[PDB]
């Protein structure tokens, strides 16, 4: 079970059951960030201290797409479904087969919609989705 070097050919992302396909160029095409800081240190006037840990386990992910990708059509249909008043979960999941690093979330929602720029060359379309519960997977292959 040799440790495969990194490659985007071996990363898979699944949005509502379908694959994510037409991604923009760059080192940051799918990025997930936790919602808050894990904890806070409180130091008093005497030198004693107290740590406090949060119970909030939430995250956002940002997906950068090309103007010609089926995932853009899927996300723009989901946006219109939300605008109509139909509010459901739509899971998102992605992982790397080389290291088993990734995470899952069983209920996501659209948070930001992209800007439609036409101009002279084609440009990015950035979507943002948010969940209330994100559990990272343990990389068991280091």
């Amino acid at each position: 079970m040799a440790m495969k070097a990194y490659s985007m050919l071996n990363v898979t992302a699944t949005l509502d059951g379908r694959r994510v396909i037409g991604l923009m160029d760059g080192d940051d095409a799918i990025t997930t960030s936790p919602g808050v800081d894990v904890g806070t240190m409180l130091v008093g006037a005497d030198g004693s201290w107290l740590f406090s840990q949060t119970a909030d386990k939430s995250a956002t992910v940002v997906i950068k797409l090309k103007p010609n990708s089926p995932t853009h059509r899927q996300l723009t249909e989901k946006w219109m479904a939300q605008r109509a008043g139909r509010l459901v979960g739509f899971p998102f999941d992605f992982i790397d087969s080389a290291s088993n690093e990734g995470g899952t979330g069983a209920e996501f929602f659209i948070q930001k919609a992209p800007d439609d720029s036409k101009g002279n060359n084609a440009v990015v379309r950035e979507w943002t989705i948010v969940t209330g519960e994100w559990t990272p997977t343990i990389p068991t292959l280091l």
């Binding site: 898979t12 699944t14 059951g17 379908r18 694959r19 999941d93 992982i95 087969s97 069983a106 343990i138």
Partner: protein, 382 residues
């Protein structure tokens, strides 16, 4: 002039109506009675919508109406009971032979697969041919329950009764032992069990151990409630010192179910119900994945797309409270609650690749139980 019924319709009846509260499952009521208008060889099973709309089965017959009576009598109600035609012949042409009953059981699946809990009621009770049901529901994704109206389970020594000749060997059957003239399996199962929604947070009814049915009566005794239900005071539940069943005792001014519907020495009903919800939910999500995509390719990307389903189901299950909280129960040290390992199609030969049958994905568990018995010490010092 004209009535107001020209533009509206307002009525009034004298009945009791409770909210619907959809849930998980359905039960099956198998007997030998046939109604000739709705089961007459055209429907080995028949569905319904509500009890009141029952006309085909007489509102006095002991089998169907008196059992649907306790099936539909929970405070929130289930829907669409699966009515009977199944073993219409009496057990077997040679009565003592269970082969005819086994074949009858094997010919009622071929019409319908929508029932999960199997109940015989008001008849077929204490028949020797019923051993086929116990042998058969093993390796069959269902739950088999038999409520006697009377037997000798109150002797902690005898070996002829249902719960004795099958005790400690079966892990998917249970007995609702009681006295005469009460349908009991329907009272709690499929009436409280059915309206359990595991899609919400903290919806794990791990016990099913102190729950009140709609209307019913208690049995009697104190040292007879341990021959039945085989429950010793603080040790637990012992197989040799009793026979497992459920009797609906009363302690204070309250009446409630007891032993939590065990099956064997320490196997409870909610474990089976919750794990079967997990399986049935993974089935539904897999099917919903095959209908959205154009295809699922036979590559590693396809294997990861398939394995994305148990990953979501496990996060759903750990939220309800069925899966444990990521800590070693022995020492309290960190330990993963569940793992999911995806196989490789790579070294599976093309000789097997042409099968269009994907390799197996393996998942890992850890159950989170609950409490049945408490202890308090109370030292006094003056």
């Amino acid at each position: 002039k004209l009535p107001y019924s020209r533009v509206t319709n307002v009525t009034l009846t004298r009945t009791d109506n409770f909210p619907t509260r959809r849930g998980f499952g359905t039960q099956l009521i198998l007997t030998h009675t046939a109604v000739s208008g709705q089961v007459d060889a055209t429907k080995r099973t028949k569905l319904y919508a509500s009890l009141a709309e029952v006309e085909a089965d007489y509102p006095a017959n002991t089998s169907v109406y008196k059992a649907a009576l306790s099936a539909f009598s929970q405070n929130p109600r289930p829907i669409r009971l699966k009515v009977g035609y199944a073993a219409t012949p009496t057990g077997g042409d040679d009565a003592a032979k269970k082969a005819d009953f086994i074949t009858s059981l094997g010919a009622i699946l071929n019409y319908d697969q929508a029932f999960y809990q199997i109940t015989l009621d008001a008849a077929l009770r204490d028949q020797p041919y019923l051993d086929g049901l116990v042998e058969w529901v093993e390796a069959q994704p269902k739950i088999a329950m038999i409520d006697s109206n009377a037997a000798g389970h109150e002797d902690p020594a005898n070996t002829t009764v249902i719960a004795a000749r099958h005790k400690g060997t079966v892990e998917r059957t249970a007995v609702f032992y009681h006295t005469d003239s009460t349908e009991y399996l329907a009272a709690s199962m499929a009436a409280y069990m059915s309206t359990r929604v595991f899609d919400d947070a903290n919806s794990a009814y791990t016990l099913k151990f102190k729950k009140a049915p709609g209307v019913r009566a208690i049995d009697k005794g104190s040292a007879v409630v341990t021959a039945i239900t085989g429950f010793v005071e603080q040790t637990g539940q012992s197989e040799s010192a009793g026979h497992c069943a459920n009797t609906l005792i009363d302690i204070g001014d309250q009446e409630f179910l007891v032993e939590g519907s065990t099956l064997t020495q320490n196997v409870f009903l909610d474990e089976i119900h919750a794990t079967d919800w997990i399986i049935a939910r993974t089935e539904e999500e897999m099917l919903s994945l095959f209908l959205n995509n154009d295809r699922v390719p036979f590559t590693d990307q396809g294997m990861q797309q398939l394995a994305s389903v148990p990953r979501a189901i496990m996060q759903l299950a750990a939220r309800a409270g069925i899966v444990a909280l990521d800590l070693n129960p022995l020492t309290g040290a960190y330990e993963p609650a569940y793992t999911i390992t995806v196989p490789s199609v790579f070294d599976i030969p093309e000789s097997q690749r042409k099968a269009r049958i994907a390799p197996a994905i393996q998942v890992r568990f850890r159950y989170a139980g609950a409490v049945h018995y408490s202890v308090i010490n109370y030292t006094m010092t003056f």
